[PDB]
């Protein structure tokens, strides 16, 4: 069986435009453990995406943290695109500053 990934996209610190920060894409609750994670800036892959080690939780589902350095701007959009076999299409979640 397959478990569909749950995604949160969010910043390490409260966002200030012009202030350097870390952008996380926290992916959880998936099986099988093989997964593809991309962080995007204005629809283009950020090259410097650091990926934490995978782990699993007490319900056996796997999780992982993807993160990158970024500087929030009034005009730049950020997202996280996830590819997994539970999903017929990749799932894209946009960074929302209120979430």
């Amino acid at each position: 069986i397959q478990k569909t990934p749950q995604i949160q996209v969010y910043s390490r610190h409260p966002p200030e435009n012009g202030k350097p920060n870390i952008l996380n894409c926290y992916v959880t609750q998936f099986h099988p453990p093989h997964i593809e994670i991309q962080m995007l800036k204005n629809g283009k892959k950020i090259p410097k995406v650091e990926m934490s080690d995978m782990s699993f939780s007490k319900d056996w589902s796997f999780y992982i943290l993807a993160h990158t350095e970024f500087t929030p701007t009034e005009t730049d959009t950020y997202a996280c695109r996830v590819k997994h076999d539970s999903m017929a299409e990749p799932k894209t979640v946009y960074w929302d500053r209120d979430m």
Binding site: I1, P14, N24, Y26, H31, P32, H34, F56, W60
Partner: protein, 278 residues
């Protein structure tokens, strides 16, 4: 809040025609990762994942690393057996997971023990709380059950759980005291977003707290309110702390009747906050 604990989360993933199966073992004390082993590493070895762990001697690392090799053999074999039991083809990839350890009371003695196994992310076999009997999820696991009932597997596990597990936990607690037993209080605040006609979303934020154990709840007129409360998974900030939020939809103009409660062990007193304009 609670009993101290030690766990290991061990996993193997088969890579048919691409090498040996991937093996990973991660160790936790009080839900903090403190050691890790990855077979795909260049010098596969157990590594300390916490600074207070660097006080163990080289022989500690060697010995547990040996265990890891033994474990790789174990998983590889059992992965093959399970292909048998489930009548599955040898070219596909599969998962085998083992989770085990102890919760310890304030006396320093065993509160509860765990030995659980999953295959392809589904329950396979698990040691009941009595630490004497097995729960088997399907008939394939029943086979392993009979076999393990006759072999006395439960006592083997129980000896580890009651002895070795607890004493190691105690040593680790002694060594990592300063960092394991601290608290970072949450910084809380409430945010306000339009939502629909006459309706607004209020969002309670809890940030930069350790440990992850936390409770947030809304309130109407000082009474708890969780009905239709959207609550997200606790998430790591990436610097050792966590974040969480909780939201509710309330009538425009009625926001002053709602309050957010935050509970966390770091706080001398629970937080109570409300949306404050302008």
């Amino acid at each position: 809040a609670g009993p101290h604990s030690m766990r290991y989360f061990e996993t193997a993933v088969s890579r048919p025609g691409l090498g040996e199966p991937r093996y990973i073992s991660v160790g936790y004390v009080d839900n903090k990762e403190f050691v890790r082993f990855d077979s795909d590493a260049e010098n596969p070895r157990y590594e300390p994942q916490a600074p207070w762990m660097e006080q163990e001697g080289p022989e500690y690392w060697e010995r547990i690393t040996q265990i890891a090799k033994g474990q790789e053999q174990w998983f590889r074999v059992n992965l093959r057996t399970l292909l048998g039991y489930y009548n599955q083809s040898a070219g596909g990839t599969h998962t085998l997971q083992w989770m085990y350890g102890c919760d310890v009371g304030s006396d320093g003695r065993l509160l509860r023990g765990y030995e659980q196994f999953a295959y392809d992310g589904c329950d396979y076999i698990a040691l009941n709380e009595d630490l004497k009997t097995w729960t088997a999820a399907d008939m394939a696991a029943q086979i392993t059950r009979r076999k393990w009932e006759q072999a006395g597997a439960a006592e083997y596990y129980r000896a580890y759980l009651e002895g070795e597990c607890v004493e190691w936990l105690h040593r680790y607690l002694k060594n990592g005291n300063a960092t394991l037993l601290r608290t970072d209080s949450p910084k809380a605040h409430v945010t306000h977003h339009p939502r629909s006609k006459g309706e607004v979303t209020l969002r309670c934020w809890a940030l930069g707290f350790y440990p992850a154990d936390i409770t947030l709840t809304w309130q109407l007129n000082g009474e708890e309110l969780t009905q239709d409360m959207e609550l997200v998974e606790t998430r790591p900030a990436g610097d050792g702390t966590f974040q969480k939020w909780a939201s509710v939809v309330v009538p425009l103009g009625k926001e002053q009747n709602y309050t957010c409660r935050v509970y966390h062990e770091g706080l001398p007193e629970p937080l109570t906050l409300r949306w404050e304009p302008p």
